[PDB]
């Protein structure tokens, strides 16, 4: 409400007397104000759900994609402008193929998230990314912060209402959750933040399963899932 400014805030590369870097903290918070994205990781599969928020009927819905395929086994959900994450998504895609050429093998999600973090370190970066894929360990989900910290999350929500979604996610999530149950829960949580009827344009749903590659649900496939709710 009322302004609460301190001399050491907004100092760029200057440590505050406490030792915190305030300008970096403010930048990271602004980055996390994008559209809500929910990822839940289950033994059966990892599911990523995002809100498209298309402005006009004329616009083609496919052109706005918040879920992208880094590789057959890895997919990324982003909150905020696609343009901000374009360089980071490209780095991950180039690294996954560069790794394949050098070692003739798939790159684990943790190694892929570390490479994107290294680019972010080499500077806030302006995006929060959820990387979900099935690797040698199994189905795995990682969260990348605008700061560049990466942690494995059983269930994570990034975006404007992430804090509320995360509390809802905590109560619903259980280790034995099936992929079909996870899809329903993430969409139910997404509906609560959106406060809008779920439709194919409103939400984009993608899943990576151990046998299957990255799959983005088609309009008909999403419609069946939303109707069951």
């Amino acid at each position: 409400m009322f302004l609460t400014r301190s001399e050491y805030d907004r100092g760029v590369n200057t440590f505050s007397p406490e030792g915190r870097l305030f300008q970096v903290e403010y930048a990271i918070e602004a980055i996390k104000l994008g559209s809500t994205a929910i990822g839940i990781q289950t033994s059966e599969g990892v599911c990523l759900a995002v809100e498209k928020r298309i402005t006009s009927p004329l616009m083609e819905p496919s052109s706005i994609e918040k879920i992208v395929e880094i590789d057959a086994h890895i997919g990324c959900a982003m909150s905020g402008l696609i343009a901000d994450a374009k360089t980071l998504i490209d780095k991950a895609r180039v690294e996954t193929q560069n790794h394949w050429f050098t070692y003739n093998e798939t790159m684990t999600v943790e190694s892929v998230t570390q490479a994107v973090s290294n680019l972010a370190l080499q500077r806030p970066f302006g995006v929060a990314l959820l990387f979900g894929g099935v690797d040698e360990k199994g189905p795995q989900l990682f969260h990348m912060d605008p700061s560049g910290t990466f942690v494995q999350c059983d269930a994570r929500a990034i975006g404007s209402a992430s804090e509320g979604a995360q509390s809802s996610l905590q109560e619903v999530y259980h280790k034995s959750m099936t992929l079909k149950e996870a899809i329903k829960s993430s969409l139910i949580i997404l509906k609560q933040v959106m406060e809008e009827k779920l439709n194919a344009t409103n939400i984009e749903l993608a899943t990576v399963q151990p046998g299957q590659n990255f799959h983005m649900f088609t309009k008909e496939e999403l419609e069946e899932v939303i109707k069951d709710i």
């Binding site: 001399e7 440590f15 007397p17 406490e18 700061s147 494995q152 269930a155 999530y173």
Partner: protein, 240 residues
């Protein structure tokens, strides 16, 4: 209202002959979670308490591998620690390629001190915000070292860095005489007890929140996490 003209840059010297930005960076280590490192005649052990964003989140990794004989625990900005860790790994690999000899830990800590010093003396550079506890085994023996954002480094019989570190340091100083002759199991127990002092009374050490790394005459640096920490944790007595 009480603005200081001399705290804007690391280059500026205060009229009291102090560089404020270096002191502010030194405080950054205290922001990080507590980490305890102690050494015996044959082994050096780093024990750290990790913290997690949520119950679902895995927990941040305080301890990292630098070489077969060298391991480090980070307190303070993680990004700075990753830059330092990458530098340390390159120096160690270079020493094996050129001399086929594990790089002496003392020489590595000196190189980190040189790298950290340059940001302190140059414009538009923030001093590193990470404090590192380094555990290594060399011909001289097991060694524990502490690095500071100031670029000073210290050889320590035992050291604790991070929030509530002083409580651990009081335990480490009290029982330091026992540490030199302690067996690996007892030395790890002493480190867990010092870390326990940092913890608030309600909270207690758990397999999820504790990371242990040990280097020794016949042991390459090994990081024990989750179930691996359970044998060490079971032996510890209940909180006094």
């Amino acid at each position: 209202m009480f603005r200081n003209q001399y705290d804007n840059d690391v280059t500026v010297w205060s009229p009291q002959g102090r560089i404020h930005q270096i002191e502010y960076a030194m405080e950054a280590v205290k922001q990080g979670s507590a980490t305890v490192g102690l050494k015996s005649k044959t082994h050096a052990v780093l024990v750290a308490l990790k913290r997690a964003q949520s119950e679902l989140a895995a927990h941040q990794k305080k301890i990292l591998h630098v070489d077969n004989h060298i391991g480090i625990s980070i307190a303070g900005l993680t990004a700075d620690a990753r830059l330092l860790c990458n530098f340390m790994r390159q120096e160690c690999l270079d020493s094996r390629f050129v001399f086929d000899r594990p790089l002496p830990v003392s020489r590595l800590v000196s190189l980190i001190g040189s790298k950290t010093q340059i940001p302190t003396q140059r414009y538009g550079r923030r001093p590193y915000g990470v404090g590192l506890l380094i555990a290594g085994y060399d011909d001289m023996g097991p060694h524990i070292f502490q690095t500071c954002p100031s670029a000073n480094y210290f050889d320590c019989r035992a050291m604790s860095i991070g929030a509530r570190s002083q409580s651990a340091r009081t335990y480490l100083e009290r029982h330091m005489s026992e540490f030199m002759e302690c067996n690996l199991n007892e030395l790890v127990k002493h480190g867990l007890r010092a870390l326990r002092e940092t913890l608030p009374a309600e909270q207690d050490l758990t397999t999820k929140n504790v990371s242990i790394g040990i280097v020794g005459k016949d042991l390459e640096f090994t990081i024990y996490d989750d179930d691996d920490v359970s044998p060490f944790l079971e032996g510890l007595e209940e909180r006094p």
